[PDB]
cAMP-dependent protein kinase catalytic subunit alpha (Cricetulus griseus), 340 residues
Amino acid sequence: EQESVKEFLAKAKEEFLKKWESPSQNTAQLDHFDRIKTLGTGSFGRVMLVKHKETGNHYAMKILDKQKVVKLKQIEHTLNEKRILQAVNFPFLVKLEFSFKDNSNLYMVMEYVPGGEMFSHLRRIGRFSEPHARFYAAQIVLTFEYLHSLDLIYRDLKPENLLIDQQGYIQVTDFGFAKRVKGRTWTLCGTPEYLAPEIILSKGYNKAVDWWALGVLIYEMAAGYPPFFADQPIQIYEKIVSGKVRFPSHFSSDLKDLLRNLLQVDLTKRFGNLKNGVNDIKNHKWFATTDWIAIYQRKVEAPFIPKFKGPGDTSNFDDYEEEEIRVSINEKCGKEFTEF
Ligand SMILES: NC(=O)c1cccnc1
């Protein structure tokens, strides 16, 4: 590739490794913030809108319950998530501003992106036009080029993890399954509709699983539904491994061709995992109109800007029962989370 790209990625890796080897720790505390609203909830954690009491800045605070993390066998994953987030720097990755822990919980305080999740916008408008899908896809391609060059696999690409910012660009969040991997890794993780065949079949897999997931995402953005859909996970998995996908007639020929090469069941033949790497994707005819540098520099006018009233507006997120952030009088799971 152009020496310009090589030197860019070399500097990117240098800067990542310095932070990776000496991670930041304990850079704020809970009582520096006011709680505003619950933005999302899961089996071992939540994301909250908070406001810093001295600066007035809004942030999204991800709170993980240490005991539930242990019970659900997510210790290494949560340590991965924070160590990676504090070390990365790319225009389409959410920014970690602070992290800390207390007797009960782990906390990651990130920039608040008021525009909401791509999932909501996609379901609201039905499907994205190919130019609109391509604008988002280009950002993911560049983000994976960045991550993979750092030996990072992302492992959770799906519309809910892609926030739309004030300029209409993507911010990838939720690094809960991201991992630094040289070669192969083995954990069953991800979301059913987005899993590559080699994950389903319990193989040692590599960064090619992210390129498979990009194929799923592009299909879902352009069609309005994912390519492998069913009521039970096992039925989804049967479709994924089958090597068969049906395309809507409205898809362009170029889109179908790209998707056949991303949704390639044989990982040794899948775009993004060949000798030419990401350039097989970047040079594909479906991306012929994409100015890769302009996308990186955020100089392309976005397909749409989310509607929101200001940095504290929560209208693009939905409503959840507001539960306590309780902190035990006794330290829980201290040993397991020493490095956090
Ligand atoms: N960084 C995040 O996870 C996030 C989530 C929701 C809104 N803004 C930011």
